[PDB]
């Protein structure tokens, strides 16, 4: 899965930067991997220019990587994440119209590469179909992602979905009796109260950046995951966002591989929850996906029976941080109409 890692990280930070620039001063939370895997899966049903353009919008350099390299990369990535103090589950599904004749190759590819489950539903029953899809996503995300599909047009013949569920224990957990309410300074004028967790007996991996107005803490989970908490100096969030790239993440990661930066730390971190909710059909045209959301999209790898077009695409995500660990969940939908 390492061949696709550069493109996936590129897409992650492109998406972040667009949200942060278009809606400043707002909580942001999404799973870039869920979006990438959903759209890569969708691309199995796209033909000709539309296929290449989806993969390009996802950051793939198709002079360096074959389409096979991308899909097999995702297959290995997803298999690895699903393997047995860390729960990660990633899955996919297609909700297929009972009426329409789907191309077996497309169906076969989504099952082989993305482990997709195939479900049949009656899209004449909009209310029932929305409940069926949203209940599946809710179940798979242990209740975290509710109402993924918030709208569903009458002429829809397929909805693609994927989800990610992540629950992981801290290597260095907090003692919950030390958690007390503290001030959190949202901006110059605005202060809220939050439960603030405290640990001060442990060594942690952290640095105060000599080149940028921020500090960086990396906390390990039990299992093969970590989290970087990046703390801009007061009022300097936008300056850090301007340089928030895959290359900057790898700079910080590499600095924090030297035990010079493993030191005793007094850490105050809030216990909190945030979420994100995005309309991808409204956002993604500005990240390379104009073709896919246009009248010109060639989705004729899904069926030859009707001329298909993109309909709504949603992403929702939640983050829950407490003394024991982190829980994060997300899901992405993509509806196809005729």
């Amino acid at each position: 899965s390492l061949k696709i890692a550069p493109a996936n990280a590129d897409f992650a930070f492109r998406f972040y930067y667009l949200i942060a620039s278009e809606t400043p001063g707002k909580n942001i939370f999404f799973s870039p991997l869920s979006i990438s895997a959903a759209y890569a899966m969708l691309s199995l049903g796209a033909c000709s220019h539309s296929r290449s353009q989806i993969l390009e919008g996802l950051g793939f350099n198709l002079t360096e990587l074959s389409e096979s390299d991308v899909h097999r990369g995702f297959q290995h990535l997803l298999h690895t994440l699903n393997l047995p103090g860390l729960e990660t589950r990633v899955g996919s599904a297609l909700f297929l119209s009972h009426n329409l004749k789907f191309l077996a190759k497309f169906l076969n590819d989504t099952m082989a590469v993305y482990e997709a489950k195939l479900f049949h539903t009656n899209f004449y029953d909009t209310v029932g179909t929305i409940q069926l899809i949203n209940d599946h996503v809710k179940k798979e995300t242990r209740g975290k992602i509710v109402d993924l599909v918030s709208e569903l047009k009458k002429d829809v013949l397929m909805v693609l979905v994927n989800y990610i569920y992540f629950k992981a224990l801290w290597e260095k957990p907090f003692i919950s009796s030390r958690t007390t309410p503290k001030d959190f300074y949202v901006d110059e004028n605005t202060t809220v109260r939050v439960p603030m967790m405290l640990q001060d007996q442990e060594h942690h991996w952290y640095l105060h950046d000599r080149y940028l107005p921020c500090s960086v803490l990396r906390m390990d989970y039990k299992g093969d995951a970590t989290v970087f908490f990046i703390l801009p100096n007061q009022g300097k969030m936008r300056e850090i966002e301007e340089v928030l790239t895959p290359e900057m993440l790898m700079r910080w990661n590499n600095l924090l591989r030297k035990r010079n930066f493993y030191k005793k730390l007094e850490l105050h971190l809030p216990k909190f929850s945030i979420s994100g909710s995005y309309v991808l059909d409204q956002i993604l045209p500005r990240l390379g996906f104009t073709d896919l959301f246009s009248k010109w999209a060639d989705l004729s790898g899904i069926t030859k029976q009707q001329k298909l077009e993109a309909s709504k695409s949603f992403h929702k995500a939640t983050l829950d941080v407490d003394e024991a660990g982190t829980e994060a969940a997300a899901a992405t939908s993509f509806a196809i109409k005729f």
Partner: protein, 34 residues
């Protein structure tokens, strides 16, 4: 110098070390909005 207080907006990058993937990315501006 040996203290961090996450009491102002901060960024969050959850990273799979086995796959080198950004699993989740975000920013906490106001943690009292779920």
């Amino acid at each position: 110098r040996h203290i961090l207080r996450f009491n102002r907006p901060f960024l969050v990058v959850i990273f799979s070390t086995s796959t080198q993937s950004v699993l989740f990315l975000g920013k906490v501006v106001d943690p009292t909005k779920p």
